[model samples]
Target: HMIREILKMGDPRLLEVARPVDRFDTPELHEIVADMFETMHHANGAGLAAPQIGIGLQIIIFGFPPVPETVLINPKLEYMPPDMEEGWEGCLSVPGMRGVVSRYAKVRYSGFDQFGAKIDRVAEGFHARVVQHEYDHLIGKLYPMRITDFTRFGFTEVLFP
Candidate 1:
């Protein structure tokens, strides 16, 4: 599978809302999912959503170590922990920037599997943060939306805060 091209931050498609993917088991959906993985890997990103690559679909892929290629389609962020912490996060599409932004310490997330079955799981630290970050893209949101203060991270803060 060839890695799909990623749309940059200024691209209006990144701001356009994505439609929910009703047919999770279709071959086209599967191809998109595979491209999401390949694109994420090619870009060296921890997670990615279809919208980041200019596809107006609701699907995301995330993984770290033993989890090997965890995919989340139509993901629903649930059980967000009250405790929040800040971390330095960067994006494949936004390129060349990272910042310390507050995020939930834990999360309960639900989504459909590649086979169309629903799966719910909890994520924490980097995992949870990455999921929420990527999930934001599906709703036409970006990391910049979560930035509180640009001065905290200094100039060239176009990507993060």
Candidate 2:
């Protein structure tokens, strides 16, 4: 497995809906998950979707400290109580830009592990934000689209580091 090129936001492929992964526990599927982690870690990203790397498959890997890494395939999410709140977000595919997007304050995500085991959990705060953000890629959506106010969006270099 290797680090694959992360497609930019404007790439047409990023706008395309990803397909569901029908097969499970195959060497090819594991390899894809492996490369995704390597790529995400190298980029210092919180999460990544397969479509971000030009693969039209419903696969996502996310690991932000205090929240254990999860290799989710064909993931499904249910927004929990309290509705959504605004939080800052950035994407590897979008590079240095940052945006404030509203996301579910709490969520329950259910999906299959890389090996086909059913996995489910509830998340909130930054954890929930990361899950919803990455899941959007599978359906051809990006954070900027979720931004209702342009005043909350800007370049990371100018906004912070």
Candidate 3:
């Protein structure tokens, strides 16, 4: 019912690791997820983590295009291949910045939904990238940390235009 302000990159809190979600199917958790979704959408973001909203919990929400919205708690990932793919990445926390980041080409992410329902799936391409991006937030990481070339990182408008 409310849109929480996303913590920006310079905030020290964004650098702290998030704690695992300990409670599920609770009204508080549900309300937090709802606020996260609202905030992400308002920012025109595809995904968001609780840490981005100043909540140090392992909760992430993502949805883009044809894929429906999803919530993941205490998410874990197993990269499928040693191969890595380089793609342009942006973050809600980082705002206007965008960078080329190398990430696993395929992965399997496992987590629980708000109701503690298990969620497991094999993903590749953009889907895999999105999950990996959110997963990084759980461990106190942002996309810029994975940038191999500073020349490829800059303001989104400057890079895209």
Candidate 4:
């Protein structure tokens, strides 16, 4: 296991939309996924996108405790039902910062797995937020950009203090 460097916010590469992963289960792709998990776990992250590690691909991985560690490649997400919910958001790319951002209460996300199998799931509550958060990275977005109110945005230490 190896931890690849995570690209911090303000990096021009993070602003551009990520590319889709066409080849499935390739050696390099497998290696990248392994490194992503290592990097994410080492850095204490709930979710991570390939773009965060400078691969600039539409790949995201998320899992925390009861949530199963899952990977979604070339994801397509759709909002479902009711309304969105606001929650404290954090990103590995934007380390030390947190913000209250709105996310769909429920979402249906589908994508390909590492082995080219179809992967689909419906996520709710915190899981939904996590999915949306990581998916945004594939679309060239950071959590701060979705924070409607600046008052709810700031450094993690100050906000949590």
Clashing pairs in 1: none
lDDT tens digits, residue span 1-161, model 2: 69899999889999998899899999999999999999999998989999999999999999873877999889999988668799889999888899999898999999999899998999988988889988999999999998999998999999997
Top lDDT: which candidate number? 2
Q: How do the residues 77-159 of candidate 1 rate in per-residue lDDT, one tens digit apiece?
A: 88565799887777777777765679998888898878898878887888788888988899888887788866555333564
Tens digit of per-residue lDDT, candidate 3, span 26-89: 9999999999999988988989999998999999989883655899999989997788999999
Model 4, span 1-161: residue lDDT tens: 78889999999988989989989989998998899999999988999999888898899999982777898999999998679898999899888989999899999999998898998888888999999999999998999888889998889899898
lDDT of each: 0.80, 0.91, 0.90, 0.90
List runs of model 3 lying over 4 Å from the truth. Answer: none
Model 1, C-alpha of 128: deviation from truth (Å): 0.5
TM-scores of the models, in the order given = 0.89, 0.96, 0.96, 0.96
Minimum summed lDDT over a 10-residue window in model 3 is located at 61-70
> Between the candidate structures 1 and 4, which one is better when assessed by lDDT?
4
